[PDB]
Design an enzyme around this catalytic site. Structure first.
Site, short mmCIF file in Angstrom:
data_model
loop_
_atom_site.label_atom_id
_atom_site.label_comp_id
_atom_site.label_asym_id
_atom_site.label_seq_id
_atom_site.Cartn_x
_atom_site.Cartn_y
_atom_site.Cartn_z
N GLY A 271 1.02 3.65 2.37
CA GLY A 271 1.43 4.03 3.70
C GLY A 271 0.59 5.17 4.27
O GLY A 271 0.54 5.36 5.48
N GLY A 272 -0.10 5.89 3.39
CA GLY A 272 -0.92 7.01 3.81
C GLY A 272 -2.07 6.69 4.75
O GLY A 272 -2.31 7.41 5.72
N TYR A 273 -2.80 5.62 4.46
CA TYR A 273 -3.93 5.22 5.28
C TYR A 273 -3.52 4.97 6.73
O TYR A 273 -4.13 5.49 7.65
CB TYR A 273 -4.59 3.97 4.70
CG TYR A 273 -5.43 4.25 3.47
CD1 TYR A 273 -4.83 4.53 2.24
CD2 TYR A 273 -6.82 4.27 3.55
CE1 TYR A 273 -5.59 4.83 1.12
CE2 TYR A 273 -7.59 4.57 2.43
CZ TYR A 273 -6.96 4.85 1.22
OH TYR A 273 -7.67 5.19 0.09
N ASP B 244 0.88 -1.17 0.00
CA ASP B 244 0.00 0.00 0.00
C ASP B 244 0.93 1.23 0.00
O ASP B 244 2.15 1.09 0.03
CB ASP B 244 -0.96 0.00 1.21
CG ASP B 244 -0.26 -0.22 2.53
OD1 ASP B 244 0.93 0.10 2.64
OD2 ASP B 244 -0.90 -0.72 3.48
N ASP C 19 -2.40 8.59 -1.83
CA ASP C 19 -3.58 9.44 -1.88
C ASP C 19 -4.00 9.97 -0.51
O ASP C 19 -3.31 9.75 0.48
CB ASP C 19 -4.76 8.69 -2.52
CG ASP C 19 -5.26 7.54 -1.66
OD1 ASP C 19 -4.55 7.08 -0.74
OD2 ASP C 19 -6.39 7.09 -1.90
N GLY D 287 -11.78 4.79 -0.24
CA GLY D 287 -12.79 5.50 0.53
C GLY D 287 -13.96 4.68 1.03
O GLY D 287 -14.93 5.25 1.53
N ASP E 34 -8.25 -7.38 0.10
CA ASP E 34 -7.22 -7.53 1.11
C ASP E 34 -7.87 -7.12 2.41
O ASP E 34 -8.76 -6.27 2.44
CB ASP E 34 -6.03 -6.59 0.86
CG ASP E 34 -6.30 -5.17 1.30
OD1 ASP E 34 -6.85 -4.39 0.51
OD2 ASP E 34 -5.97 -4.83 2.46
N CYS F 12 -7.68 -28.52 9.57
CA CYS F 12 -8.90 -29.29 9.74
C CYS F 12 -8.75 -30.74 9.33
O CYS F 12 -9.66 -31.54 9.52
CB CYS F 12 -10.05 -28.65 8.97
SG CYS F 12 -10.33 -26.90 9.31
N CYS G 268 -8.09 -27.56 4.49
CA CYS G 268 -6.81 -27.08 4.97
C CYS G 268 -6.17 -28.13 5.88
O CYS G 268 -6.87 -29.00 6.43
CB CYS G 268 -6.95 -25.74 5.72
SG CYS G 268 -7.46 -25.81 7.49
N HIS H 161 -6.09 -21.87 9.12
CA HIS H 161 -7.42 -22.25 8.67
C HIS H 161 -8.17 -21.07 8.07
O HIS H 161 -8.78 -21.21 7.01
CB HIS H 161 -8.24 -22.85 9.81
CG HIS H 161 -9.72 -22.89 9.53
ND1 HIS H 161 -10.28 -23.81 8.67
CD2 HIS H 161 -10.70 -22.07 10.00
CE1 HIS H 161 -11.57 -23.54 8.65
NE2 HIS H 161 -11.87 -22.50 9.44
N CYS I 223 -13.74 -28.03 4.98
CA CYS I 223 -12.52 -27.32 4.68
C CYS I 223 -11.40 -28.31 4.43
O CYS I 223 -11.23 -29.28 5.17
CB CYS I 223 -12.17 -26.41 5.85
SG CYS I 223 -10.61 -25.53 5.65
#
Ligand SMILES: [Zn+2]
EC number: 2.4.2.29
Length: 372
Positions: free
Chosen positions: A94-96, A92, A146, A220, A270, A313, A310, A339, A308
């Site tokens: 870094g601003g957020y 990203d 941004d 946003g 994400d 499990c 994975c 999981h 599942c």
């Protein structure tokens, strides 16, 4: 092999499935990206993240620029070699996180000044410094820097914030392009702003398209407006972005949010939820989330989720994980996170398959019915 290539294999309504080919690997879309905050996907080895089916991970630039520092990571060989993840990484800007975790933030047209939240204050962040940092980390997908608009926002407030963001988008593009090694090996995504106002969203989309980006993020959202509002905004906003480029919805991760977003044309997601909830004792299942700490799971021999596939499990019971979490054992966090990430990846695979088979609409309907 190519620097960046997005191909849509199948469509159903606004939903689509395809692949993004980049030098470090292929990314199947719709994609979910596990979050690597401090150069690590919480409690998981890179191989385990890959094992869950993840094609790409997100790196938080804010954290990395503070500890251990972008310059140090570059000196050490780049983020990939540092953490042991050889597939693509999206970072990203870094601003957020600056506006959310930094002390005494100072907004200006040049950028933002702030105090690190841990020890003094590695301090200046501008469109060009952000791109430079992401270059130093060596990320494959770079995010334009941004100014996110808080919710609620007044029209004038959202407008001024959006306008600044577009000026910064141009500065991000220019900075990215000056660095040949970066422009030739990485991709740059622009971010649409405009709060919940379609006229502002439209202006943003147009400005972004005029500049030209490899992918477009819808920024946003997931900032307090609620799912209904988010979806309403997605309805008119996504069609504004170029159809032949990936659409990335930042910070959106609840299973139902993802399903609704894919229906509206989103290709990438994400969120920290799977890793976060894992540590908290919340496990995702096709029948909704369950909190493993509750006493009813004390002697439950069934796996976290019986459908599942994975590793967790396939080998451990709810009873054991329940014990580990209540005992505050590290393995508890490890197992829960694996999981959860695996569940998300399986959800994405089911979404991709249902779109390819023209039954995504039925899948979404059936998913919601069972999940709730
Ligand atoms: Zn599982």
């Amino acid at each position: 092999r190519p620097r960046f290539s997005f191909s849509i294999a199948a469509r159903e309504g606004k939903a689509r499935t395809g692949t993004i080919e980049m030098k470090r690997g292929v990314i199947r879309t719709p994609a979910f990206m596990p979050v690597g905050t401090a150069a690590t996907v919480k409690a998981l080895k890179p191989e385990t993240v890959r094992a869950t089916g993840a094609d790409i991970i997100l790196g938080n630039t804010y954290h990395l620029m503070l500890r251990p520092g972008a310059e140090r990571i570059a000196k050490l060989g780049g983020l990939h070699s540092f953490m042991g993840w050889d597939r693509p990484i999206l970072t990203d800007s870094g601003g957020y996180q600056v506006m959310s975790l930094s002390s005494l933030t100072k907004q200006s047209e040049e950028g933002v000044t702030f105090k690190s939240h841990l020890d003094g204050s590695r301090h200046m962040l501008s469109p060009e410094r952000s791109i430079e940092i992401q270059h130093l980390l060596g990320s494959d997908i770079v995010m334009a820097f941004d100014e996110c608009t808080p919710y609620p926002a007044t029209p004038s407030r959202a407008a001024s914030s959006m306008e600044r963001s577009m000026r910064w988008a141009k500065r991000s593009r220019d900075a990215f392009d000056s660095r040949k090694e970066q422009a030739e090996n990485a991709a740059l995504f622009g971010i649409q702003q405009g709060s919940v106002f379609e006229n502002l969203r439209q202006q943003s989309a147009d400005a972004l398209a005029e500049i030209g980006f490899d992918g477009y993020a819808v920024g946003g959202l997931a900032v307090g407006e609620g799912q209904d509002e988010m979806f309403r905004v997605l309805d008119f906003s996504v069609p504004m972005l170029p159809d032949d480029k990936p659409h990335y919805l930042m910070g959106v991760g609840k299973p139902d949010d993802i399903v609704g977003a894919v229906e509206r044309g989103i290709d990438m997601f994400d969120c920290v939820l799977p890793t976060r909830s894992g540590r908290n004792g919340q496990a995702f299942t096709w029948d909704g989330p369950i909190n493993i700490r509750n006493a009813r799971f004390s002697e439950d021999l069934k796996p976290l989720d019986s459908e599942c596939h994975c590793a967790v499990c396939q080998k451990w019971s709810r009873a054991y994980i329940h014990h580990l979490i209540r005992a505050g054992e590290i393995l508890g966090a490890m197992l829960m996170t694996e999981h959860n990430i695996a569940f998300y990846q399986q959800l994405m695979q089911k979404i991709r398959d249902s779109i390819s088979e023209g039954r995504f609409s039925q899948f979404a309907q059936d998913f919601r019915a069972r999940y709730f």
